[PDB]
């Protein structure tokens, strides 16, 4: 059987570890994407909340949700329940926890098909365990089929540091060397399980900027003072909409039109922080529906953002506790001889974004010529010269792939 042809019954459901969540316009939006977008917002609001307004933030919530959905496969009892609760999977109307995997199956088949296009989307979620660990036979099948992940054994007990390098080597190798340190220089003999996940993305703007127009304008940091940023410039039709409290929403599609960058730029008078605190799937979904094609002037800066962290802490502060507890963790999916206390040592994540005139960490140079164009002098301008939010969504799937805050694109 194939990941894109796997029917629902191919995702075995054992009674010993099943959860049951109590009950509670336009095209069709998958239930799973909604559940993911809820975690994305929820999680982001936290991360931001604990970060200074002048810091850049960037992560892939889809990646995190995927790594743990793949992990909850071997979970059970309170471990399994908590995972469902934190990762909003239980908001899914009233289906069983095993069906969630059938969804990710259908979602991952769409996001990572080989049918090449201009924008490439590579996933890297793997679970690293010590050699002595034997991932259950059936747990393996699914983890691989549905999440294309392995349960790669390593030696943390004897010669840990050599395996930590093995890890960073793999990720680096899957992110085309753009992420070479997912595991900070955090591993030892007292390390049983390690979950690593990231998403690599590269794309070309469906509507490129001309480096010929990139001058150094001024970016106004949240602390009041300013600094210099490489400001890209262009004019054209874009899905746009100035929403509540004067906040501009801008969709910049990558070639292909199925993956787009959605920028949220609040008015000078409003603090990005006040908008981050108002984000919710419902509110985001509403803005995206109001976006209307339109000619306008775009002023977005060139920026590079490489954010990376250890999820364990924040996740626990969010309700994910057992999974990380040597005594509470219930992982019937993983097994070791004479070791009945399998827990997750940690979970690491790292996202990277390079944005210039070409697109997502693309770097060719494209010049542009426009003959005989005249725009209504009274045209809208989107000058992102103050902190703004960023989203990399997968439109046909209404899935939030990446999200961050460019609070300082200054050299």
Ligand X SMILES: *[C@@H]1O[C@H](CO)[C@@H](O)[C@H](O)[C@H]1NC(C)=O
Ligand Y SMILES: *[C@@H]1O[C@H](CO)[C@@H](O[C@@H]2O[C@H](CO)[C@@H](O)[C@H](O)[C@H]2NC(C)=O)[C@H](O)[C@H]1NC(C)=O
Ligand Z SMILES: *[C@@H]1O[C@H](CO)[C@@H](O[C@@H]2O[C@H](CO)[C@@H](O[C@H]3O[C@H](CO)[C@@H](O)[C@H](O)[C@@H]3O)[C@H](O)[C@H]2NC(C)=O)[C@H](O)[C@H]1NC(C)=O
Alpha carbon distance 219, 387 (integer Å): 8
Instruction: Identify which of residues 69 and 400 has a Cβ nearer to ligand X in the complex.
Output: 69
Strand residue runs (E) in 20-169: 57-59, 120-123, 126-130, 133-135, 153-154
CB 387 within 8 A of CB 221: yes
Nearest to 36 by CA among 59, 62, 60: 62
CB 265 within 8 A of CB 247: yes
Q: Which residue stretch of 133-141, 209-217, 366-374, 397-405 sits at the interface with ligand X (rule: CB under 6 A)?
A: 133-141
Count of residues touching ligand X (by CB under 6 A): 7
User: Does 14 contact ligand X by CB under 6 A?
Assistant: yes
Q: What are phi and psi of 358, to 5 degrees?
A: -80, -50
Could you say which of 203, 266, 333, 404 contacts ligand X (CB under 6 A)? Answer: 333
Alpha carbon distance 323, 126 (integer Å): 16
Does 126 appear as a known binding residue? yes
* The pair of three-digit structure tokens given for residue 65, joined into one six-digit string: 């949700």
Residue number with the smallest Cβ distance to ligand Y? 173
The Cα diameter of the chain in Å comes to 77
Least separation in angstroms between CB 21 and ligand X:
21
User: Does 76 contact ligand Z by CB under 6 A?
Assistant: yes
Instruction: Identify which of residues 199 and 288 has a Cβ nearer to ligand Y in the complex.
Output: 199
User: Does 77 contact ligand Z by CB under 6 A?
Assistant: yes
User: Does 18 contact ligand X by CB under 6 A?
Assistant: no
Could you say which of 204, 236, 332, 395 contacts ligand X (CB under 6 A)? Answer: 332
Does 304 appear as a known binding residue? no
Q: Binding partner of residue 148 among ligand X, ligand Y, ligand Z, none, CB under 5 to 8 Å per kind?
A: none
CB 124 within 8 A of CB 197: yes
Nearest to 265 by CA among 386, 118, 410: 386
CB 357 within 8 A of CB 208: yes
Least separation in angstroms between CB 266 and ligand X:
49
Could you say which of 1, 5, 16, 376 contacts ligand Z (CB under 6 A)? Answer: 16
Alpha carbon distance 317, 315 (integer Å): 5
User: Does 72 contact ligand Z by CB under 6 A?
Assistant: no
User: Does 256 contact ligand X by CB under 6 A?
Assistant: no
Q: Which residue stretch of 27-35, 124-132, 136-144, 376-384 sits at the interface with ligand X (rule: CB under 6 A)?
A: 136-144
* The pair of three-digit structure tokens given for residue 186, joined into one six-digit string: 């955090």
- If phi > 0 it is left, if psi is from -120 to 50 it is alpha, else beta; for residue 220 that is beta
CB 173 within 8 A of CB 341: no
CB 151 within 8 A of CB 74: no
Least separation in angstroms between CB 366 and ligand X:
53
Alpha carbon distance 42, 286 (integer Å): 17
List the x/- string, 194-233, binding to ligand Z by CB under 6 A. ----------------------------------------
Instruction: Identify which of residues 20 and 113 has a Cβ nearer to ligand Z in the complex.
Output: 20
Strand residue runs (E) in 11-130: 57-59, 120-123, 126-130
Other C-beta atoms within 10 Å of 90: how many? 21
Q: Binding partner of residue 174 among ligand Y, ligand Z, ligand X, none, CB under 5 to 8 Å per kind?
A: ligand Y
Q: Binding partner of residue 136 among ligand Y, ligand Z, ligand X, none, CB under 5 to 8 Å per kind?
A: ligand X
Least separation in angstroms between CB 118 and ligand Y:
18
Instruction: Identify which of residues 128 and 391 has a Cβ nearer to ligand Y in the complex.
Output: 128
* The pair of three-digit structure tokens given for residue 10, joined into one six-digit string: 């191919």
Instruction: Identify which of residues 203 and 333 has a Cβ nearer to ligand X in the complex.
Output: 333
Question: Which residues within the stretch 150-209 sit at the binding site for ligand Y (CB under 6 A)?
Answer: 173-174
Instruction: Identify which of residues 17 and 353 has a Cβ nearer to ligand X in the complex.
Output: 17
DSSP element (H, E) containing 372: none
Question: Which residues within the stretch 318-347 sit at the binding site for ligand Z (CB under 6 A)?
Answer: 330
Does 30 appear as a known binding residue? yes
CB 93 within 8 A of CB 388: no
3-state SS assignment for residue 44: helix
Instruction: Provide the binding-site residues for ligand Z, judged by CB under 6 A.
Output: 15-16, 76-77, 330
Annotated binding site for heparin: 30, 110, 126
Instruction: Provide the binding-site residues for ligand Y, judged by CB under 6 A.
Output: 173-174
Instruction: Provide the binding-site residues for ligand X, judged by CB under 6 A.
Output: 14, 136-139, 332-333
Annotated binding site: 30, 110, 126
């Amino acid at each position: 059987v194939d990941i894109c042809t796997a029917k629902p019954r191919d995702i075995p459901m054992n009674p010993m570890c099943i959860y049951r969540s109590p009950e509670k316009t336009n095209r069709r939006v998958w239930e799973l994407s909604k559940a993911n977008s809820r975690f994305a917002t929820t999680f982001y609001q936290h991360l931001a909340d604990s970060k200074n307004d002048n810091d850049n933030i960037f992560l892939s919530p889809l990646s995190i949700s995927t790594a743990f959905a793949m992990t909850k496969l071997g979970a059970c009892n309170d471990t399994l329940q908590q995972l469902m609760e934190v990762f909003k999977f239980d908001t899914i109307s009233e289906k069983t926890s095993d069906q969630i995997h059938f969804f990710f199956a259908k979602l991952n088949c769409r996001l990572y098909r080989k049918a090449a296009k201009s924008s490439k989307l590579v996933s890297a979620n793997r679970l690293f365990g010590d050699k002595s660990l034997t991932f259950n036979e059936t747990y393996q099948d699914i983890s691989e089929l549905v999440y294309g992940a392995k349960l790669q054994p390593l030696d943390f007990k004897e010669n840990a540091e050599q395996s930590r390098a093995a890890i960073n080597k793999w990720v680096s190798n899957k992110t085309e060397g753009r992420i070479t340190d997912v595991i900070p220089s955090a591993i030892n003999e007292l390390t049983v399980l390690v979950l690593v996940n990231t998403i690599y993305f590269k794309g070309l703007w469906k509507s490129k900027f001309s480096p010929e127009n990139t001058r150094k304008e001024l970016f106004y940091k949240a602390d009041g003072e300013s600094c210099s940023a490489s400001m890209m410039y262009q004019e054209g039709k874009f899905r746009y909409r100035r929403v509540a409290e004067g906040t501009q929403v801008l969709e910049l599609p990558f070639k292909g039109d199925d993956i787009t960058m959605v920028l949220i730029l609040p008015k000078p008078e409003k603090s990005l922080a006040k908008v981050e605190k108002e984000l919710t799937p419902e509110v985001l979904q509403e803005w995206l529906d109001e976006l209307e094609e339109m000619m306008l002037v775009v002023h977005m800066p060139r920026f590079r953002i490489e954010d990376g962290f250890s999820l364990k802490e924040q996740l626990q502060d969010m309700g994910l506790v057992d999974l990380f507890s040597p005594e509470k963790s219930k992982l019937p999916g993983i097994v070791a001889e004479g070791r009945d206390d399998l827990y997750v040592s940690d979970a690491f994540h790292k996202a990277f974004l390079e944005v210039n005139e070409e697109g997502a960490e693309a770097a060719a140079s494209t010049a542009v010529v426009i003959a005989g164009r005249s725009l209504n002098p009274n045209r809208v301008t989107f000058k992102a010269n103050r902190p703004f939010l960023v989203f990399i969504r997968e439109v046909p799937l209404n899935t939030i792939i990446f999200m961050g805050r460019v609070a300082n694109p200054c050299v």
